[PDB]
Design an enzyme around this catalytic site. Structure first.
Site, short mmCIF file in Angstrom:
data_model
loop_
_atom_site.label_atom_id
_atom_site.label_comp_id
_atom_site.label_asym_id
_atom_site.label_seq_id
_atom_site.Cartn_x
_atom_site.Cartn_y
_atom_site.Cartn_z
N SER B 47 0.77 -1.25 0.00
CA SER B 47 0.00 0.00 0.00
C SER B 47 0.82 1.33 0.00
O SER B 47 0.25 2.37 -0.29
CB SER B 47 -0.97 0.05 1.18
N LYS B 50 0.60 3.43 -3.15
CA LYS B 50 -0.50 4.36 -3.46
C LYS B 50 0.03 5.77 -3.69
O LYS B 50 -0.61 6.58 -4.34
CB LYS B 50 -1.53 4.36 -2.36
C1 LIG Z 1 -1.78 -2.06 1.88
O1 LIG Z 1 -0.62 -2.34 2.11
N1 LIG Z 1 -2.80 -2.83 2.09
C2 LIG Z 1 -4.14 -2.33 1.81
C3 LIG Z 1 -4.54 -2.03 3.24
N2 LIG Z 1 -3.61 -1.15 3.85
O2 LIG Z 1 -3.46 -1.23 5.19
S1 LIG Z 1 -2.39 -0.30 5.78
O3 LIG Z 1 -2.09 0.79 4.89
O4 LIG Z 1 -2.70 0.14 7.14
O5 LIG Z 1 -1.11 -0.91 5.85
C4 LIG Z 1 -4.58 -3.33 4.00
C5 LIG Z 1 -3.17 -3.94 4.01
C6 LIG Z 1 -2.63 -4.14 2.61
C7 LIG Z 1 -3.36 -5.21 1.85
N3 LIG Z 1 -3.93 -6.30 2.55
O6 LIG Z 1 -3.45 -5.15 0.60
#
Ligand SMILES: *C(=O)N1C[C@H](NOS(=O)(=O)O)CC[C@H]1C(N)=O
Ligand SMILES: *C(=O)N1C[C@H](NOS(=O)(=O)O)CC[C@H]1C(N)=O
EC number: 3.5.2.6
Lengths: 241, 242
Positions: B47, B50
């Site tokens: 993430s 992003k």
């Molecule tokens: C990003 O890394 N993800 C999407 C979402 N983000 O959570 S976080 O930014 O607090 O780390 C959930 C974790 C992860 C995913 N499961 O894709």
């Protein structure tokens, strides 16, 4: 619009008088404790740094938020003024001399034009080009502050997008996982009635709440009450936890 | 010039954790880390991707602005906050994967590759799905490379418009008060071992800017809060924040 006199208690409690005005952007509804005072026009004082910043940027008097404004070497009452500043820190510490210089470089003619274009308050610049917001002819009400801020939020002022974004960045006051506050404080000291201002907005996930408050301020002892009282109303209305 | 300083490991030890915190003092142009080797180990951005994804989406007009609404597709997912409409601000805040997948699809392989090369971002490798390569594909980035990327972003030096960079910095806003402003993005690499949590960004002071990038082993989602907590313990230690 709705008058909500219950908020007066927050003022009463701090042995204070004033107005808080609130605008719900999604519902296009306003709320205030005092419909009459909400339309009372006062000197903008340091709240004038918003439009002043905007104009300075749009004309290139200020290149960007990093540009350094060197202290002139004259020691003043407020310690944080006695040092170099950029737009970010000048806004934060409300550094008058920097904003005076902006105004001098902007000039009477261009300043008038811009305020008329902004539809800002009474649009009157009478007085010194570098203090008219403090002891000259300009006057603005809380509701008119909101109206101005709403244009700024939506990037609808007659200046560049870039200028508006930079100023909103410089207005940043507080942020966390519940809300963001962009705002500017003020204290009209030269002309009676002495008042404190806080104007700006609260950004939520789903909505934006604009605010403008002023309150009687016979001494600088009560300054903290501008924020404290505004927040007490925001909590009450369940805008902030 | 980098300096190792192993004293920070205690903060990890104390939470019965392993990882790296990397700090960069912009005024002094000096870096600091507890683990020089891990600082230069490359992992899936997850993430944290992003940031550049948002940048690219904006610059190409896939996202018009921070207000544009992205309608929920109607599919209910594990994280409740994803199951609703979003803009860039809220999508960043709640780290809304489906929105960012859609951005990526619209961007396309070719334009995504060019932009990452132009960003000098990590290993610049897009191998895998155009909408998940940052989570289970071939892209990799180290904490030090995160910082180098973030530094370009801070100074508006990335090969995208000023406007795009400003909007993303606005969307990265995490925390602000009278002492500091934090702009950052969290991440959790879950598909490929080693499972790790990330927090990257910077701390703005009146007089300086401190860039940061941390990752830490994260076998379960239990430890997520530690990304921020540990980073802040280091920041307190170094007297960057109170
Ligand atoms: C990003 O890394 N993800 C999407 C979402 N983000 O959570 S976080 O930014 O607090 O780390 C959930 C974790 C992860 C995913 N499961 O894709
Ligand atoms: C602005 O109104 N002023 C500059 C400075 N601002 O402090 S404030 O924003 O908290 O109100 C001091 C007060 C005032 C002034 N006297 O010039």
């Amino acid at each position: 619009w709705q008058e909500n006199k219950s908020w007066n208690a927050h003022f009463t409690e701090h042995k204070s008088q004033g107005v808080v005005v609130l605008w719900n952007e999604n519902k296009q509804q306003g709320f205030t404790n005092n419909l009459k005072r909400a339309n009372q026009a006062f000197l903008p004082a340091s709240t004038f740094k918003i439009p002043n910043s905007l104009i300075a940027l749009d004309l290139g008097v200020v290149k960007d938020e990093h540009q350094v404004f060197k202290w002139d070497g004259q020691t003043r009452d407020i310690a944080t003024w006695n040092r170099d500043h950029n737009l970010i820190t000048a806004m934060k510490y409300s550094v008058v001399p920097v904003y005076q210089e902006f105004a001098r470089q902007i000039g009477e003619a261009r300043m008038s034009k811009m305020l008329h274009a902004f539809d800002y308050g009474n649009e009157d610049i009478s007085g010194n080009v570098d203090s008219f917001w403090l002891d000259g002819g300009i006057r603005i009400s809380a509701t008119e502050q909101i109206s101005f801020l709403r244009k700024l939020y939506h990037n609808k002022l007659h200046v560049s997008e870039r200028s508006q974004r930079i100023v909103k960045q410089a207005m940043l006051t507080e942020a966390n996982g519940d809300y963001i506050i962009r705002a500017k404080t003020g204290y009209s000291t030269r002309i009676e009635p002495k008042i404190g201002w806080w104007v700006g907005w609260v950004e939520l996930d789903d909505n934006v709440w604009f605010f403008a408050m002023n309150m009687d301020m016979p001494t600088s002892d009560g300054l903290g009450l501008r924020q404290a009282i505004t927040k007490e109303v925001l909590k009450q209305e369940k805008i902030i936890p």
